[PDB]
Subunit: 387 residues, 4 copies
């Protein structure tokens, strides 16, 4: 049967470690795929870790220019949370250099985008076979979440972008049932930019905190209703959560527009808590190093900067990077609410380190109604490798 | 229960990528079987990739003369589509240096041919155990499809050849239920040659587009009816689809006889679309490089050369090779028709490259009702290896 | 449904080998996690071997300072009994540098402790997802069993310590159902010390034989009743069973207090047999070498030293170490009583051997109503490795 | 439910290849256990290949003196037929340096013998856990079949020996249900010797063709009835089938006594066919090289040497060795009779080859109602290895 996922997100006080794969450290001797963009999504029976491979293995010559982000070898696959993205326990998902996945309660639906930049094709799979397709509608690197999509009562949703990484681009919302596309919407967002949305379900609607790679150091937000009507804007909090970004003291919040003259970014996330908000971010304001999640009072509806909680998951002497959302299915947690969880990607190698390769590891954390002490569950791999 | 597979093939506009294993690139460091002749077949629950191994691994000394095509070590095995033909996720099927496999909806049926060339034995397995046998009837390399066989309402069919690779040979159609042979027919085809048939089910009959290794640059075709009555001939299209072959402008089509003075060939395929036809072929007319599928208007019933669609899957600067058919089970696609899919084998190593070994990789594509942009999902391995 | 586990422990005459993983010997060429603290727990369908990894592999540079006992890479995982703690057959459990696991008959419950020493967090998982948390209550290395916890009629129990490894510490009993904590108790034990309890179910109560790392060479014992009321003390036997320890002839037993001026220890175990007791111990009185289990007449209720049975499992020329309890589920053994079993950890590498690493192997033995001959199923690995 | 296995053996005309693992060739680069004594047994769902490991891997230093036959590292494990005895797809069975396994239709029962030679213990497992034990009754290397045991209507049987490898020894028949021993018998066989029995079920009784390592070049035979009453003797055929052995022309058959002055032997097998018999043997009469099975007219009841069929499976230029029986469950073959199958072990390394190690590979063949052509599915590994 289908996963209702109509409950509201659980109000958490802190997050506890769920897993840590140690992908890279292990890959020193083992046969581990070189990856990037790992993320978590759950079925009502287990949670899996999805990832994009370079079709090559750690400590091998094919892991060379594995920094480019795209190639015809790039593939989407998965293992159960905590397992390294190793070859012998991996499941093939889709041919992709950009993906998103989610389970509706019956089967898994994946979306892998591959093909030429000017005419990429996003193939949708369901139950292990392709079912529908979305062709590039703006001829410029069609891309999606790199995080778990969202399924509410059988219908699954996700966000996609097509256009430049700087100036105005084009964004759309997609909705599907059993792998077949059943609706779509264009998101009007002039002056704003949207990418790599980290979504989760809350009170029957789909909430996402994305990435503005054009001019925003604060993150865009969009509440998608089942009928595809929607509300787009920015995380209200008077604190920036993208990288690169300026100081918090130099940042005035804004619920409607981007702020700060930073034109880059990194995939991040946020969880609504009533009117409050749990927002993650790299400790460093310039580099993808360290990770922390802050809970801002009324930070979801106000330009508030009233911090009530702060928990470090990767200190600032260690590499971090991408991070995304997903929720624990009620059939697994037993709760009456949707337990909010996230993962932190820890990128190793180029561009920051002197190695011919680039891959990443991940740590997973979940909701919990207790204050969790600060610590650093960093990658821990020793570079360079037999390079 | 049994898979009806009585529906008609879906009318597709293009094909989207299903998977890509990256077998060879990965095999640079991992433990991957050296293979050749990979192919896809599906059960109503998953699709698998079958392959013939040399009983050796990539980057190992036993992968030496792995070009001979036959040996007592040659084995048939399988993994789920997209997975590399690796040792730790592989399932044993049959002892074979030539095979074919298909699922009837209840269990898997395989056919592995092994033994001496002058007295080979084809052992039939069902549910994981041998059930019946077919001995060489003409004492000269008994062989079969190297592609998915076909099951319609419980009864599975496949084609076999026995005789020389040049002059006249002998071809037969076999039919079985639950692993037990229940009928067979001799195919009268004087002047014609048949090998490595790529079949699929359409409107209750079994349609195949095979390989004439004697004199045909155009491919033979045979519609097998449940009673084993049949229609044999050649793809009508006024365009040749075998390798080697002459220019399209030098080729007059023919629905009844072989044309062009080329005596070699490569396993290829074709899908009927009403009276139209989707035909695959290597871009190069002499080498096994590049892959493309063309849709010819009335190309299945007329000496037509009216091209309506063309899609490249492996450009001409990359190695290609074998390619075969199979269909997506309705229990997986949800469609009311049989989604036509194919795979392209990308051979690396000898004879074209300077290495002591020879293996291949594969990419899988499926039906889809959209035009898919051209691209190249080539092997990508870097030769030579630690050789 | 739930495992009753209300039966009484079976009265055994000796123990027979169940399995031997050969983790280290195999790890010489294979991809085996570097481990420590392995233990066994069973579901009504299979028994698994749990272990703490260093997030690194044998014969790899990351296995360097793998002697420290704790780190942010330390992870809890499992394989089926007898399998080496290898990467490709491993299941992720929890982020932990100290753990305990048990099955209630429906799902697995694990408890992994990680985080800073002064504020560690123990995360509880159930069915593959975290469900509740226990924060360090005394700010000093929160730790637990490193052995199978105990589930009786749905409710699972385990013991935890928090405080110094020398002087007085703090110990508590925890009880949970379906991953959710439902009760807890503080254990009053002034002058006594408790750690790494090896528990099992007997006559509806939970019996444990733990480790006093403060001043006891004899082991503490605690019978936990379903209501969390309890009885704590020491194994009565007039024979010491911890390491280091003094001679048996210099040891007067004691049911209420620790004896001998040894302040260290090693995880060991004991099984009640009516009023008798099966107690394990390293042959050496100073080093963690050799393993043997002795059955003392009335050794559970009297300062008795009347030995009735002695069986060696690892001779004194070989390395041993940790050892813990667990029981065979009646749904697996068919018995009307709870078959008592144990495992012996065989540590290799530092501190005793000249290698840059430290890991361990294990052998498993079970109840049985026959006298089993002495022998040595030692590790057998050849050190040093390619170091 | 239980497997009846009361049908009679199928009358076969020849045997077709079932599988070939290529364990050693693959082990050149992969992580394959060093093995010996591999054998096949089937459940009503799949057939598995059991084997004894040395707790070490091919191409590793621990594979050194792997010729001794026994050690505390020796372990029994299994994979599905055709898979190499690799580490990542292996299942642990029992601690053993001599074993036997069989499925009764509900669960697997294994018997692993380990421990000191003068007091070995055979531990019996069922459903993955030890259930009963058999201690050495004659204090001299307790041993068993090294081949599939036999289950008829829930009760499983097997044969065991204890005593010298030369002069008189002691043999017994064991019978069990659900892992619990329910009966046993002593086999009176003065002047005769019995070892490594290859049994199968036929007409409701258990038939075995064993090995006389004392003075017999012809093989002993024993028909065990459900009540443990029995008939022991020798394969009547006027042709010897053990190794070493004298010429066929120098051999007068004998149904009651051993013949030829050869005191060694090798595990072999035989299938009754009415009053006829299919008997296997190494081609060489002195070395364990080449394998062939001959069908002798009335060879089961008469000193007959009338050969009606001969099929070679491993030519005489290749190494062979052990071989044993088992039957295909009717739930897998669909037949109304019990399809007789066997496996041939192909030993590589010492004592015949210049390597520091010793292991083996296997090929499996099954019943079939057709004449199968001769061929050689030999090991094929290239020695020495990276030694
Ligand atoms: C489809 C694709 O290439 N996505 C890439 C993404 C993208 O370039 C950016 O979001 C601007 O559009 O950037 C990054 C990145 O580490 O910053 C890696 C992604 O693989
Ligand atoms: C059974 C067998 O050896 N088949 C071989 C096939 C055959 O020789 C040809 O079709 C003429 O009969 O050719 C090829 C090939 O790459 O061209 C590889 C096949 O393994
Ligand atoms: C949580 C933790 O670090 N436990 C460690 C434990 C502990 O130090 C001792 O019991 C005193 O408290 O000691 C040992 C040990 O081999 O002796 C290894 C354990 O990993
Ligand atoms: C338990 C045991 O060691 N069995 C061994 C067996 C035995 O020595 C012989 O049957 C005389 O009893 O011989 C052989 C062998 O290759 O010949 C290998 C077996 O492992």
């Amino acid at each position: 049967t289908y996963m209702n996922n109509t409950e509201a997100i659980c109000d958490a006080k802190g997050f506890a470690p769920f897993s840590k794969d140690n992908g890279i450290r292990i890959g020193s001797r083992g046969h581990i795929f070189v990856i990037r963009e790992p993320f978590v999504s759950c079925s009502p029976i287990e949670c899996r870790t999805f990832f994009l491979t370079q079709g090559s293995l750690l400590n091998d010559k094919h892991s060379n220019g594995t920094v480019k982000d795209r190639s015809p070898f790039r593939t989407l696959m998965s293992v159960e949370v905590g397992q390294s993205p190793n070859v012998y326990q991996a499941r093939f998902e889709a041919v992709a250099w950009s993906a998103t996945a989610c389970h509706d309660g019956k089967k898994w639906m994946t979306v892998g985008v591959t093909g030429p930049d000017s005419k990429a094709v996003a193939v949708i799979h369901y139950g292990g076979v392709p079912t529908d397709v979305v062709n590039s509608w703006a001829g410029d690197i069609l891309r999606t979440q790199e995080s778990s999509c969202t399924c509410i009562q059988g219908d699954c949703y996700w966000v996609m972008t097509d256009g430049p990484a700087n100036r105005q681009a084009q964004y759309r919302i997609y909705k599907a049932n059993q792998g077949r596309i059943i609706g779509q919407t264009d998101i009007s967002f002039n002056g704003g930019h949207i990418e790599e949305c980290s979504c989760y379900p809350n009170d029957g609607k789909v909430e996402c905190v994305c990435r503005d790679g054009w001019t925003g150091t604060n993150r865009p937000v969009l509440v998608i209703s089942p009928d595809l009507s929607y509300r787009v804007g920015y995380l209200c909090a008077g604190i920036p959560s993208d990288t690169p970004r300026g100081e918090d003291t130099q940042f005035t919040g804004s619920c409607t527009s981007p702020m700060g003259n930073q034109g880059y970014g990194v995939k991040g996330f946020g969880f609504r808590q009533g009117t409050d908000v749990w927002m993650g971010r790299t400790i460093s304001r310039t580099s993808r190093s360290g990770f922390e999640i802050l809970r801002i009072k009324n930070g979801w509806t106000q330009t508030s900067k009233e911090q009530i909680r702060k928990q470090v998951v990767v200190d600032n002497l260690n590499w971090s990077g991408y991070s995304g959302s997903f929720t624990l299915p009620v059939e697994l947690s037993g709760k009456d609410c949707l337990v909010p969880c996230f993962w932190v990607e820890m990128i190793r190698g180029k561009p920051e380190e002197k190695t011919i390769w680039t891959s990443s590891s991940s740590i997973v954390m979940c909701g919990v109604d207790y204050e969790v002490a600060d610590w650093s569950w960093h990658d821990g791999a020793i570079l360079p490798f037999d390079i």
